[PDB]
Symmetry: C4
């Protein structure tokens, strides 16, 4: 990555490892080690992501925002 | 929100995203992005909430308190 | 409690809420709100407890120790 | 251990307790209390490990790295 990983990884149903980092990013990583995508946030992602029934990744950041991100990496919504 | 989200989101059985923030609040957010309710606490909510069989949300805060909150947003009890 | 709750609560199979606090303690709390027991540790319990198949509560502390605690509150072992 | 345990323990399917520590290590501990193995990292392991279907332990560290570790203790990959 590019920042310390204080976030705890969540594992998708397809096996994808979802984790945040204090480099302002959220990383989706395949089990083989290659990166699926990364979603840039406005602050350090200290929160551990959560996965719902639809596969949406819910993670908070140090920019007052709670990000909802689709499995493909596009932003669903943000609070 | 109004504060950095160091808390990790818990996802309800109905799909509701439960998360805390260091703005002293606990947020219940629908999957569509709209807010269900928020419960104000006496300190920054750094702990990640937990959900039991009855749907009660258990989360700790930086005010020495462990809050138990019903799914509708009213306080069950606090330790 | 007596200290800020940075630990995230784990919920037992009987419904018991297991959480730590930075007052050096680990708290087991019944869903009704009354306390089951508390196990004193040598440092602030910042880690979130985990529960295994036998009901043992595994939680780390800021005293270099990883505590294993039986459901009744007595120490199983510590690393 | 040799450092404060800010990481939250993950419990394997065989019962093994996987946890990190700020002594730069990741600890795999049998339920009897004896250590299975430890994997040294380049920074304090503040993240809580996660376990996938294959039993791989995914944990982040304060050295910008996301470690993937096989159940036997050898490194799968790292990001
Ligand atoms: Zn760094
Ligand atoms: Zn930053
Ligand atoms: Zn801020
Ligand atoms: Zn405050
Ligand atoms: Zn205090
Ligand atoms: Zn202390
Ligand atoms: Zn120390
Ligand atoms: Zn160090």
């Amino acid at each position: 990555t590019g920042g310390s990983v204080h976030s705890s990884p969540a594992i998708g149903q397809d096996g994808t490892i979802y984790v945040g980092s204090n480099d302002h990013y959220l990383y989706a990583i395949n089990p083989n080690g290659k990166l699926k995508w990364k979603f840039e946030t406005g602050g350090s992602v200290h929160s551990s992501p959560a996965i719902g029934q639809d596969g949406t990744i819910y993670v908070g950041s140090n920019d007052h925002y709670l990000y909802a991100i689709n499995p493909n990496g596009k932003l669903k919504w943000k609070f």
